[PDB]
């Protein structure tokens, strides 16, 4: 309870801000800005490498300082570990350490982006601040079953409709429907009413089933949404 005293309030407030700092800078690390007239235009991330570097370090530091002393006052410092927010904090602050251990000295392309990614999970730490996140967590703890059925039903649909699609729009001049696992993209595009217009049937038998697919999708997704919002 931040409202317990005033220093609790200030601690809550102050940790509720470097999360925003770190997420914003994880965004900015990508925006290409600053002409760099000598060469191509650099992403601000590696251009001012030390700046975002030291800011990221400061944020990691603050988060560790918080998390540790939070861990200390825990009565059940074990259950405090199996707590959800503990997992959030640890998996948010770890990729920076493993990044330092696996710095560009020890680097490969297809395995460091997967640790560039997990920096975002720090944003969940707003859970402690706005109820809505927590309350969504709760209502998903509750509504967990219907979602399973949604998932399985969706799987059934996607399969059947992608199959009848492929078999239908196989034989054609420029069939982009070349494989069943390619007709999953199309079928989940349709059944969610998106329609990128990228893969669109072009025979007679393709259009019918694309249409029907659209309706069936409107249906299948409609099942859990009432119980979700009601809960």
């Amino acid at each position: 309870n931040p409202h317990t005293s005033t220093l609790a309030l200030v601690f809550y407030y102050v940790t509720g801000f470097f999360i925003a700092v770190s997420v914003i800078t994880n965004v900015v690390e990508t925006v290409p800005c600053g002409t760099v007239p000598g060469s191509k235009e650099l992403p601000c991330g590696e251009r001012y490498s030390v700046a975002f570097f030291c800011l990221d370090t400061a944020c990691v530091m603050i988060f560790t300082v918080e998390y540790l002393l939070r861990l200390f006052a825990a009565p059940s410092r074990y259950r405090f570990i199996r707590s959800v927010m503990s997992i959030i904090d640890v998996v948010a602050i770890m990729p920076y350490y493993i990044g330092l251990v696996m710095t560009n000295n020890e680097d490969v392309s297809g395995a460091f982006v997967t640790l560039r990614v997990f920096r975002v999970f720090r944003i969940f730490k707003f859970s402690r601040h706005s109820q809505g996140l927590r309350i969504l967590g709760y209502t998903l703890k509750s509504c967990a079953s219907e979602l399973g059925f949604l998932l399985f039903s969706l799987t059934m649909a996607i399969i059947i409709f992608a199959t009848v699609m492929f078999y239908a729009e196989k034989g054609s001049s420029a069939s982009k429907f070349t494989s069943i696992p390619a007709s999953f993209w199309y079928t989940i595009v349709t059944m969610t009413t998106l329609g990128y217009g990228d893969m669109v049937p072009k025979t007679i038998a393709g259009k019918i089933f694309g249409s029907i697919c659209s309706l069936s999708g409107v249906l299948v997704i409609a099942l859990p949404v009432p119980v979700i919002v009601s809960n």
Binding site: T6, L9, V10, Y13, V14, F17, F18, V50, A51, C54, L55, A58, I62
Partner: peptide, 26 residues
């Protein structure tokens, strides 16, 4: 009430000049 809010701001500025120091230490 507000004195709590007052204590809030005075902390963040410290965290700023620290990173502003290493900005010079580049």
């Amino acid at each position: 009430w507000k004195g709590i809010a007052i204590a809030l701001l005075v902390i963040l500025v410290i965290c700023s000049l620290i990173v502003t120091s290493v900005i010079l230490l580049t």
